Each structure stands twice: as C-alpha cells, then as structure tokens.
C-alpha cells in the first residue's frame, strides 16, 4: 500500500525488445508488418511515403576526411 | 626469466570487429574508402552505382509471413 500525491507516471511494468524492430517514427514493425529500410533506418510502409519524399536519399557515405589526394 | 612471476593471464580482448566493416563483394570498407550502404548491406562506392541501379538503396522487407487461414 503506497500513497501519492498527484497521479505520477512509475515504471508500472516493463520489458526489453527481444528482437522487435521500430520504424523512425516509432510505431512498431513486427513479423507481419510491410516496412522498407532506406539505407540503414527502418520505415515502416505506411510512414515510407513520407520519409521518401523527405529523403529517399538511401545511406549516402563518403570517406568524408577528403584525404587531399596528393598535391604535389 | 622464470619462476619470478612477470607474465599473466589474460583473455581473448579484442576478437569482435571494431571500425572494420566489408562491401557486398568482399573487399574492406574503411572510413578511408568512400562507400554505400543500400539497406543494410555494405557497397564499396567503386561498384554502388551498378548496386543503385538493381537495387536502389531499398531493401523491401514485406511481411512474407502471409499465412492465410485455412484450416484444411
């Protein structure tokens, strides 16, 4: 028997992922679940429309040092 | 020299891959060599734009667990 002042938010109950995957939007993508991964993330197909218009962009990586080639 | 402990034990460390990565052939994709990621899977950026043009940075994930309810 606890007591409370005002109606806080406590832990109540809660569990680890095992394996289940969330799109960027975090909804949630289970076994049954259409999703695209774009690049590397995670979408979801019904959020995909949205997120493709924003990047569609795939994952786009570089060196990104530039090493200078040589110069001279 | 021996018996004068100087010499101790210790565990494998270093086994896992730390900021090693490799491309879908098998080459070695470091922070040094440009490269792209098309959904999940490593491309050295010296063969992405052929993997862009068959697979275009998506990986469709579908359900695939279409099940339908059919008891015989």
């Known amino acids: 028997?606890?007591?409370n002042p005002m109606v806080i938010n406590?832990?109540?109950?809660?569990?680890t992922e095992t394996d289940?995957?969330?799109?960027?939007?975090?909804?949630?993508?289970?076994?049954?679940?259409?999703?695209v991964i774009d690049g590397g993330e995670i979408i979801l197909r019904e959020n995909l429309e949205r997120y493709l218009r924003?990047?569609?962009?795939?994952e786009?990586?570089?060196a990104q040092?530039?090493?200078?080639?040589?110069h001279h």
């Open 20 to 35: 289940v995957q969330i799109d960027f939007y975090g909804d949630e993508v289970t076994p049954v679940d259409d999703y």
């Open 65 to 70: 040092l530039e090493h200078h080639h040589h």
């Open 54 to 58: 924003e990047q569609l962009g795939f």
């Open 10 to 15: 406590n832990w109540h109950d809660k569990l």
């Open 60 to 62: 786009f990586k570089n």
């Open 1 to 3: 028997m606890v007591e």
